[PDB]
């Protein structure tokens, strides 16, 4: 939600990172979150996608009366009920899709925030401010899940609080 | 010294219809209603018997021009709008039930 | 002789072509991949259910917020 817009320069994933440091800027995608998203979406799609052979006559060429009206009424009832079912199903499933995608984004943000610990402070726009020198290997370690906060904690605390 | 998190976007995405709003843009969507047909009837895996100019009752009774349908079996009989009768005029009480 | 099975009847003017399809409608045979169809209410075989809606899109991505 706090993320303003999407990135159209991202074509190798769904969720990812952008960074700036002394050695420049960069972009990378997170595979674990994109794969979880597509896994849920496909698992939901496969549940959305009957075998009837002999049925009643549904279109008539003559005017008969009671029986023909009953058959027409039965057909209309079935059609309207199934149309309502289709509308409700698609609405609910699109809603759940939207929330699951936003939830995945929020999960990635929270996991990065928990990894960074007291070394960074959230800027409110979906971005963190790392309070120490974080080169390309540092960003790689943040991204793949092997970031150690105790080897930067002293410098991060010095920069964060004392000016 | 700064790290941003975000998601991808597309130049133009499909409009889907959800519980709250009926127009919300989404990167990709799939159609769930089949609204097209090829205009032709496949012959597999069901055994379809095209009746040409013969109704089912006409072949049942033995209309002279329906002598090709003697001792026939089908999974779906197709009745055509060009079917006609060429024997003694007949009527069937409860025609629909027999058919 | 009388047998009980899956046989039925249909009124149609569509031609017959050598192909494989599990669903037959008077407008022709239709694919069964999608769960709904709006082609015709007269069906034979494994067919999608008939609905009144011409379109029904299911989201397979996230919300699109384009760039400026």
């Amino acid at each position, epitope marked *: 939600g706090f993320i303003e817009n999407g990135w159209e320069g991202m074509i190798d994933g769904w969720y990812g990172f952008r960074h*700036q440091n002394s*050695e*420049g*800027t960069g972009q990378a995608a997170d595979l674990k979150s994109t794969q979880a998203a597509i896994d849920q979406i496909n698992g939901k799609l496969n549940r959305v996608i009957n075998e009837k052979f002999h049925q009643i006559e549904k279109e008539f060429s003559e005017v008969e009366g009671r029986i023909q009206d009953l058959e027409k009424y039965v057909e209309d009832t079935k059609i309207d009920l199934w149309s309502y079912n289709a509308e409700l199903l698609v609405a609910l499933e699109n809603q759940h899709t939207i929330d699951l995608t936003d939830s995945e984004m929020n999960k990635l943000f929270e996991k990065t925030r928990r990894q960074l610990r007291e070394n960074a402070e959230d800027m409110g726009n979906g971005c963190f401010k790392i309070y120490h020198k974080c080169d390309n290997a540092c960003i790689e370690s943040i991204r793949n899940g092997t970031y150690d906060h105790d080897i930067y904690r002293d410098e991060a605390l010095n920069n964060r609080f004392q000016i | 010294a*700064t790290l*941003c998190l975000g998601h991808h976007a597309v*130049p133009n995405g499909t409009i889907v219809k959800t519980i709250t709003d009926d127009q919300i843009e989404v990167t990709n969507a799939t159609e769930l209603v089949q609204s097209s047909s090829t205009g032709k009837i496949c012959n597999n895996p069901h055994r379809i018997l095209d009746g040409r100019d013969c109704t089912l009752i006409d072949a049942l009774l033995g209309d002279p021009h329906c002598d090709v349908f003697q001792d026939e079996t089908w999974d779906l009989y197709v009745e055509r709008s060009s079917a006609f009768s060429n024997c003694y005029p007949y009527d069937v009480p409860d025609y629909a039930s027999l058919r | 002789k009388m047998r009980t099975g899956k046989s039925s009847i249909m009124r149609s003017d569509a031609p017959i072509d050598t192909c494989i399809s599990e669903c037959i409608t008077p407008n022709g045979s239709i694919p069964n991949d999608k769960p709904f169809q709006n082609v015709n209410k007269i069906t034979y075989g494994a067919c999608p259910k008939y609905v009144k809606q011409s379109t029904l899109k299911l989201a397979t991505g996230m919300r699109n917020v384009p*760039e400026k």
Partner: antibody
Amino acid sequence: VQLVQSGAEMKKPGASVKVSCKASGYTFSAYYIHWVRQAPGQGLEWMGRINTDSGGTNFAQQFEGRVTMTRDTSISTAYMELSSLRSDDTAVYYCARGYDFWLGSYRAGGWFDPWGQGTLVTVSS
Amino acid sequence: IVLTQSPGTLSLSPGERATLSCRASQSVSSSYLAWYQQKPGQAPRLLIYGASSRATGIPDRFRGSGSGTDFTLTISRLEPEDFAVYYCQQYGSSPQGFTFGPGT
């Protein structure tokens, strides 16, 4: 995502040339359009950029008074008009979309992608 | 800001390492530099952005580095298709600053 330009033009000296750049595959009004010039045997030379939404333009302090750039959002095409053509103005003219790299609340860097195919403009008598 | 590239030409055999250097007039942010490759008769193709990051489909043999006024682009192994003219661009340094380099 592609940019297709106009054809080659053999304009005479002391005239004006209008080169078009049609955008297909992306929202035309959402990205800047840049015009880069490459003389035969020389390097690329930036000429200017045009804002496709507000019509804003920004040139180099070398083409001021000679280049006018206009946009047409209805047909999604960017026009570069260069006046007072001279012998040195014979070159290959490119249109490239500028992608600004947005790190949240501020922009930092970017790249030119995609490019046009280029139009060869010759000035001769 | 004016970008200068050295050397003008590099004579290197296939399979060798190539190091190309682009120097800035004053100090510029490393976020502004990009590298482009232009084979004859084709529009330039983006290679590296942000002075360290590769494009969407650029092989791992193109490496970018540098900070301040000196930036380098390195090719670990020169494949036959990697023989072209390479340009350095500053992007976003100023509303009027999008200049290229001399070429190399």
